[PDB]
Amino acid sequence: GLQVDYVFRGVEHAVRVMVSGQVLELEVEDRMTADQWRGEFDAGFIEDLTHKTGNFKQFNIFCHMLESALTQSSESVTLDLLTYTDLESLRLNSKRYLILIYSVEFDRIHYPLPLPYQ
Amino acid sequence: GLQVDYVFRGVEHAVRVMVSGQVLELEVEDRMTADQWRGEFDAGFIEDLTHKTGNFKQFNIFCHMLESALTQSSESVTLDLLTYTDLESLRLNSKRYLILIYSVEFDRIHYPLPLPYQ
């Protein structure tokens, strides 16, 4: 597995990704408050997601983009973490949405991954 | 209108593009033989085309990418001109297919524009 510290809106978070076969496991944790948001996504779900943005990606390609954003080893992919306030403005209430932002010359695509609160 | 000389497989061609409202006009000409291939595409057709590749583009964005490839002012878009031999291998007989090749970090997309022989 891969585990990195990543800063979302000033707050360092612990992020864990697990890719095993055709399923993607993701965990975001605020260590100070012990808050955790976790999501499980299979290849079918991911491809439905990327297709809906009009910028399709294979599941294995999406997972690599996700890792490249996390390790900050790629210039076109980045991460953000949105609350429920950010989404209803864009369109419990403890859910978070990890956004994979794909920025290239003629595209800016947002791939949203919903992470229920734990 | 825009008119540039562009080399396809070693042969310099004359290319003319005309964007007027929501229709795209394209002409490729071999001056030595006076051969011309011309295509007319409306915004609806272009968007059906880009959507089918899984990498959607708005009509006005597609036209700009097309011009950037022609003037060679962009690092992600390039052109090629395919005959009917190249396509049946990939899958009258005088038709040509202008391919807009979109190359970014996690995508390589081919947008094919069919140009009937004149």
Author numbering:
A (entry chain A), B (entry chain A): 6 to 96, 114 to 140
Report text from the authors:
The highly conserved coiled-coil domain-containing protein 61 (CCDC61, also known as variable flagellar number 3, VFL3) is one of these understudied proteins. Further analysis of CCDC61 reveals that its coiled-coil domains are capable of directly interacting with microtubules.
To gain more insight into the domain organization of CCDC61, we determined the crystal structure of the N-terminal domain of human CCDC61 (hCCDC611−143) at a resolution of 2.6 Å using X-ray crystallography. As indicated by our bioinformatics analyses, we found that the protein fold of CCDC61 is remarkably similar to the canonical SAS6/XRCC4-like fold, which is characterized by the presence of a seven-stranded β barrel with a helix-turn-helix motif inserted between β4 and 5. Remarkably, one observed CCDC61 homodimer (D1) is highly similar to that formed by the SAS6 head domain (van Breugel et al., 2011, Kitagawa et al., 2011). This analysis suggests that hCCDC611−143 exists in a monomer-dimer equilibrium with a KD of 170 ± 18 μM, suggesting a relatively weak binding affinity, similar to that observed with SAS6 (van Breugel et al., 2011, Kitagawa et al., 2011). It is worth mentioning that the head domain of hCCDC61 contains a conserved surface area that is not directly involved in D1 dimer formation as described in Figures 2A and S2A.
